[PDB]
Amino acid sequence: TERVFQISFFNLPTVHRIRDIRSEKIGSLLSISGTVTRTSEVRPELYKASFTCDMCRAIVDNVEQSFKYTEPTFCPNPSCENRAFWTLNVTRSRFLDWQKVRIQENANEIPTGSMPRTLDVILRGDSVERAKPGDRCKFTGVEIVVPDVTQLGLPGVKPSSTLDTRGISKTTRSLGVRDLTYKISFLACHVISINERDQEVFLNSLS
Amino acid sequence: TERVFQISFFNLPTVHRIRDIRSEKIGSLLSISGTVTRTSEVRPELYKASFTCDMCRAIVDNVEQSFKYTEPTFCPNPSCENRAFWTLNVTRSRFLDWQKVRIQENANEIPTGSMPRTLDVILRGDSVERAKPGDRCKFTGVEIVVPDVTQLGLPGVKPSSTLDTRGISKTTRSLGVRDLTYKISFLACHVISINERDQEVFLNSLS
Ligand SMILES: Nc1ncnc2c1ncn2[C@@H]1O[C@H](COP(=O)(O)OP(=O)(O)OP(O)(O)=S)[C@@H](O)[C@H]1O
Ligand SMILES: Nc1ncnc2c1ncn2[C@@H]1O[C@H](COP(=O)(O)OP(=O)(O)OP(O)(O)=S)[C@@H](O)[C@H]1O
Ligand SMILES: [Zn+2]
Ligand SMILES: [Zn+2]
Numbered sequence A, B: 001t002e003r004v005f006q007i008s009f010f011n012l013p014t015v016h017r018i019r020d021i022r023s024e025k026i027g028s029l030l031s032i033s034g035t036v037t038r039t040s041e042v043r044p045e046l047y048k049a050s051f052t053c054d055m056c057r058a059i060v061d062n063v064e065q066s067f068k069y070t071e072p073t074f075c076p077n078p079s080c081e082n083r084a085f086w087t088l089n090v091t092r093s094r095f096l097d098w099q100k101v102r103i104q105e106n107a108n109e110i111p112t113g114s115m116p117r118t119l120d121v122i123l124r125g126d127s128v129e130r131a132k133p134g135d136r137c138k139f140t141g142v143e144i145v146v147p148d149v150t151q152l153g154l155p156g157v158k159p160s161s162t163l164d165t166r167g168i169s170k171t172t173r174s175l176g177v178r179d180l181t182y183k184i185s186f187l188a189c190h191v192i193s194i195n196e197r198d199q200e201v202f203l204n205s206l207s
Helices: A199-204 B199-204
Strands: A029-039 A043-053 A059-064 A086-088 A094-104 A118-124 A136-147 A182-193 B029-039 B043-053 B059-064 B086-088 B094-104 B118-124 B136-147 B182-193
Touching: A029 A118, A094 A136, A118 A136, B029 B118, B094 B136, B118 B136
Parallel strands: A118 A182, B118 B182
Antiparallel strands: A029 A094, A029 A136, A043 A059, A043 A086, A043 A094, A094 A118, A136 A182, B029 B094, B029 B136, B043 B059, B043 B086, B043 B094, B094 B118, B136 B182
């Protein structure tokens, strides 16, 4: 259909630690480093979903799934005028390769008395399986946020969202309340570590 | 789309009276005669209906309506597998011209002491408006039967139909009972009587 392109930035001026990750840098390019502990099996991630409407059994395709399962809003046929009822058909959909790496802090980066921090890096596209457990790898990519329901019970005023009930024309319970609790994750577009059994291939690629 | 053709038989060897009409001749060509008393306004009759299925909003056309409103049995798309839920869309349908003539017995055909009999003749196609009240017209066409719910309370064993409940695989109320009471009507394909103000047109068509 269409080739998906992966822009892989690298050679950033600075490399950040896991504990240097802060919420100001959400959705920004940056490089981190860490020791890989666990890697997921590459798994298919819904990239361009196809949807079938229950009223109009047409097929709407190329529904871009940015970061989460998102049904469309308008049907292709003008008569249906439906927005909330759709079915995902998996064969007629498109997928990407997704691996979730877990990275601990390097042994030389852990502060005094503190315990190592862990981060969930998301490898996508051709960067999957480029990191294996034990290796110290540096990742370049986006610092993103993912839903974290475990923040319940934590101290503080956890953010929440409510639908705006003005300009709505009541006649004389429509809550729509969600929990805006997130945790910082990483989406890597480039992995480099910081099968050789053949002699000639080893000598060929060497200065 | 397609021209509808009217075969108009005439010049039958014998002409029947209204009281000579018997149930052996149902669905057979024959000629009657009678004095017209009432004629309907020409009305549109559903001839080739178009149906839209609620599941598959496709359009099935050329659904031949023989003598009564008949929905289809199989959808055009193989996936739907629906048979009982359809909607008739009137613009996308086809119609014929229908007039219902009422004809009494001729004054010379009424028996002794009896009262004149009346019959409802159905003119279709190009034969509409060919009979007007007062004229003694002879009709050629089919002796048909139409539902007659007024036969309730009449003496005798009125026929009825029940669904066959054998070979049905019960597991241990599905009545489907209908009234098979009909009355004899007539469907005329040819009308001849048994605007002239201009002199020349009158003399031209004359022996
Ligand atoms: N039920 C299982 N049977 C066998 N091996 C397993 C099983 N669960 C996990 N593993 C092993 O753990 C490795 C990690 O792959 P996954 O279990 O798919 O990923 P994961 O680290 O659990 O990440 P997520 O969060 O579940 S996507 C697998 O490749 C297997 O080697
Ligand atoms: N409500 C009415 N208003 C005016 N004229 C009427 C009315 N009803 C009947 N007529 C007259 O009666 C004539 C017969 O036409 P229809 O009433 O359509 O047919 P009909 O003889 O009642 O047959 P069916 O059985 O109803 S199809 C019309 O052409 C009018 O002249
Ligand atoms: Zn729709
Ligand atoms: Zn259907």
